Amino acid sequence: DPLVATNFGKIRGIKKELNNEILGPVIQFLGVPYAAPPTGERRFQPPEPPSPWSDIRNATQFAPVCPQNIIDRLPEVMLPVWFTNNLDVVSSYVQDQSEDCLYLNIYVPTGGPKPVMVYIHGGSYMEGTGNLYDGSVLASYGNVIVITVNYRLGVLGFLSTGDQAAKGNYGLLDLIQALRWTSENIGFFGGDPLRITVFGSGAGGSCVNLLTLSHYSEGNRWSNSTKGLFQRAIAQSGTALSSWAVSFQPAKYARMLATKVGCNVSDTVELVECLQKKPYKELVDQDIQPARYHIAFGPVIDGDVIPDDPQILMEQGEFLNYDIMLGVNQGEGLKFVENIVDSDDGISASDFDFAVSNFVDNLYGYPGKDVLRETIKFMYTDWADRHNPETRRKTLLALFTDHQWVAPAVATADLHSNFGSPTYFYAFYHHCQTDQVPAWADAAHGDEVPYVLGIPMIGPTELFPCNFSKNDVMLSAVVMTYWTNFAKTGDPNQPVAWTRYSQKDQLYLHIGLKPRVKEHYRANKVNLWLELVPHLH
Amino acid sequence: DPLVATNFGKIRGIKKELNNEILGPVIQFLGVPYAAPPTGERRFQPPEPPSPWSDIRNATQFAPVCPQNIIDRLPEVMLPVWFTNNLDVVSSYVQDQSEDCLYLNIYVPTGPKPVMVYIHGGSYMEGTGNLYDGSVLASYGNVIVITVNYRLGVLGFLSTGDQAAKGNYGLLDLIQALRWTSENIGFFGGDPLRITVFGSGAGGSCVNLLTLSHYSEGNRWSNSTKGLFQRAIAQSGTALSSWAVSFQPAKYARMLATKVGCNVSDTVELVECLQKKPYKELVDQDIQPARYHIAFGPVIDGDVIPDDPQILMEQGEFLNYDIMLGVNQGEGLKFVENIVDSDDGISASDFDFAVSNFVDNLYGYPGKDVLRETIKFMYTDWADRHNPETRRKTLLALFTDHQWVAPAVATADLHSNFGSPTYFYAFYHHCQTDQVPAWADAAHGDEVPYVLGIPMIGPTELFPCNFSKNDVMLSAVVMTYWTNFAKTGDPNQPVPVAWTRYSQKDQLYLHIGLKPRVKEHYRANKVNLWLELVPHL
Ligand SMILES: *[C@@H]1O[C@H](CO)[C@@H](O)[C@H](O)[C@H]1NC(C)=O
Ligand SMILES: *[C@@H]1O[C@H](CO)[C@@H](O)[C@H](O)[C@H]1NC(C)=O
């Protein structure tokens, strides 16, 4: 049997055969505590280390996930499509909940310590679990250790009063704790604590980026030369600079919740103490909605974990030199457009104007809006066929995609390479059409996930039920190789050459069935939001 | 010897051998009167027909050109570069002047042939058809070529805003030449029902303006074809540009009247006063308009020009001619030439100044702040935003696009829209002179020597460039397109790389270079800025 001794006790994993000939087996350690349960007085408090246990602890089944409610209005626009498309399956992964949810899962392959890829999930900061992301194939195919983590979500993980009463960022601190646990225990599993790659998609991608800006991710016990906890980062369709990356009005929504559950909101210490006497179910189940493209509960600017606005930090180059790799998908903004399209696959010029105008209002309140609505309306029309209704959606979809994902990604990519971090950029332009998605839709938000995890190798799963072709399998194998090569050496080419990114040339890898390296991804539309729109104010 | 009988008498031309083996000889009839001298009481009056002569009139030397002053200064930005580059040679063509200058030149090769009437023009102020030798074009193409001299500057376009001086005398002269041609060219072996008019620059403007005038309607030969001429080619010139037509004619008529001592309350007295003065005195007065506008030119008289060409075009008020338009890569050379430093680049400093003054001259604030920023963004290549060699290339494009390209596309669009067989091109080659920078591309008027077939003869006093073997080949191709178009209204058919018909939807055009290809939507990104965005602002 597979036994492993850790600094808190011995644990037993479980061997797992994969449904493919090319793939060797993996031992998976499910439900490994990396922190003390954040219950009672430790709610709204930094994570403490886990209690040691005397005997052998079985790590063979998922632990209950962190409190969340996806069955009872959720922001489809932030959430991956494969998530919202089959919530029924996703729900079975989230049924068993508990405030005691700080657990991570290890996937170990089968003559030196292996790289460790720690996955950080995330949709809107409100929900999800690392359990959804099976790390078996990636570990086996890549010959690396893969870890998935569960961190505090929503209220419990990010509620803040704007005071020392509740400073917030408990979720990010949990991630820090999981990374420290990993740093100081993964070696016992045959992992290399000095080649740890952190990677995540969506809000998970945001979390990855936010950590690189935090001084809590500085320093590791093993090396005086390498002062990072983790050494590399991959942020997939997520950044720290988007409108919904961090919560800017945390005290507002903390008051709201406290009110809704009947707690006095005058004194902040009294407010917090009251919330702590209430079930997590009651706090989670309250209806708290922010602005359309903003969040209520998430990462906050506390002057500690996150010392300042991520924008300012990046500009001042306030981050350790990590090997970075970030990118976006062709059509992230599917769910922004999906409700608008009619029986034929197009949107009228009428609906177009409404959508673009409301977009301007939500993200750019008039101080001057008139000018802006026209500049954008112009920029996101293809005059080649200005009356085509099928082309109007593709470009409207591009508006959301560019502003919410692409421009933030490029800005991030630019500033990292600018300050000396080996940066790599990509554009994911393939996917596997499900019977739940339109036939005209391209690579949407989160569609790159199943390729990174190697799902096509195993074939359709309950979570990813698409009929993966042979092209899907090959593309997946290519992706996993880039990722894992990057994990092994900080170079996606060293275990089509993926060239290093730089602000001048802005070379990136266009990922498709025919992967090529291009240059200046959508710079025309990008520089609009980074150079023009700001100067108009 | 070559004798020809016309409705006004017999005339003797002169045979001319061309300096190329492939070219047969041509008989050229130089100094043929097509109208009575507009002298004395016929100054500021429509052109009357020429007097008949009993004997043989020798047409073997150029007649004196229309009054003009380039020696005493010259709007370099409107004028072709080959013009301003060697004024010494150009001057020899303009030395001998006379108000009696309504003469045209015939070039006959060796059924009835097509007739190509060339309409010269720089700023409406100067020039002559004599500069444009039509020998090679006629010989190579096997068509008759005509060059015309029409009234210029004050004498040709002065208007008081009254019936006292209605203006457009120059345009009426062109009409007179065309009527003369229609009713006499048959005697030379020409086809009065296959007359093509073509011109570059202001000449191009003149071509376009004629298509909007009802005076070019009706011919004596056919009841089905309602046009005097049947086809039109407008090279780097339109009726929609800022300097195509004079909108403040009365202002500048008074200015002149003032300088010569004729400023009178009553316009009929004013005109009568100007009529008692030498043409030299009127031509030599210093009258300069706004930076990108004209003082003396085509005017909106409600007769010859029934309304603003823009309105006319939009309402489709024009006969359906076979149309052909295009521009050169870098028309706006002379806009930028003064700015470049020893290195072939312009600083970010000078750039902002040049662009801002451009905004002020063409778009005086009534809102300018927004506009200068929108433009500054659109005309910078963010690929390398700091490159000084690239800053000039894009600033040059600003002028080029606004003054030439956008007016051309708009014209091209509205013509094809209302049913005229339209054709579009972009001229991307030239022959670098020791007078032009080595970094300059196809500038204003650089397509002329290729249209006239000069590379076939080799360097001339006017076109002294060392034409290569490729130049000769490209010229043959250009002349073939032009002459095919004259013959059949189709640049692909001589009788009775395929250049595809243009249309507002597909907007196919011929990219003319050493490797001529058909592309689509020429600089539509930059065009639609001026046609769709800035207006709505
Ligand atoms: C732990 O699990 C293994 C297999 O998963 C099993 O053999 C063992 O008996 C379990 N231990 C306990 C104490 O239940
Ligand atoms: C025209 O030229 C002929 C010879 O070609 C000559 O006899 C005649 O005198 C000339 N005409 C005039 C008006 O000089």
Numbering used by the authors:
A (entry chain A): 52 to 123, 125 to 162, 187 to 443, 445 to 572, 590 to 631
B (entry chain B): 52 to 123, 125 to 162, 188 to 443, 445 to 574, 590 to 630
Give passages from the manuscript.
Members of the presynaptic neurexin (NRX) and postsynaptic neuroligin (NL) transmembrane protein families form the axis of a signaling pathway that is crucial for the formation and function of excitatory and inhibitory synapses throughout the brain. MDGA proteins are attached to the postsynaptic membrane via a C-terminal GPI anchor, and their large (∼900 amino acids) extracellular domain consists of six immunoglobulin-like domains (Ig1-6), a fibronectin type III-like (FnIII7) domain, and a memprin, A5, mu (MAM8) domain. The extracellular region of the NLs contains a cholinesterase-like domain that forms a stable interaction with the α/β-NRX1-3 LNS6 (laminin, NRX, sex-hormone-binding globulin) domain (Araç et al., 2007, Chen et al., 2008, Fabrichny et al., 2007).
Simultaneously, the insertion point for SSB in NL1 is in close proximity to the Site I interface (Koehnke et al., 2010), suggesting that presence of SSB might affect MDGA binding. Next, we determined the crystal structure of human NL1 containing SSB (hNL1(+B)) at 2.55 Å. The nine-residue SSB (NRWSNSTKG), inserted between Gly295 and Leu305, was clearly visible in the electron density; the N-linked glycan at Asn300, a modulator of the NL-NRX interaction (Chih et al., 2006, Comoletti et al., 2003), was, however, not fully resolved due to conformational flexibility. Superposition of NL1(+B) and NL1-MDGA1 (0.308 Å RMSD over 434 NL1 Cα positions) or NL1-NRX1 (0.306 Å RMSD over 428 NL1 Cα positions) structures revealed that SSB is spatially immediately adjacent to both Site I interfaces. Indeed, removal of the N-linked glycan (Asn300Gln mutant) partially recovered the NL1-MDGA1-2 interaction affinity, whereas it had almost no effect on the NL1-β-NRX1(±4) interaction. Taken together, our results suggest that, despite the proximity of SSB to the Site I interface, its presence does not eliminate the ability of MDGA to block NL-NRX signaling. Rather, SSB provides a way to fine-tune the NL1-MDGA1-2 interaction at excitatory synapses.
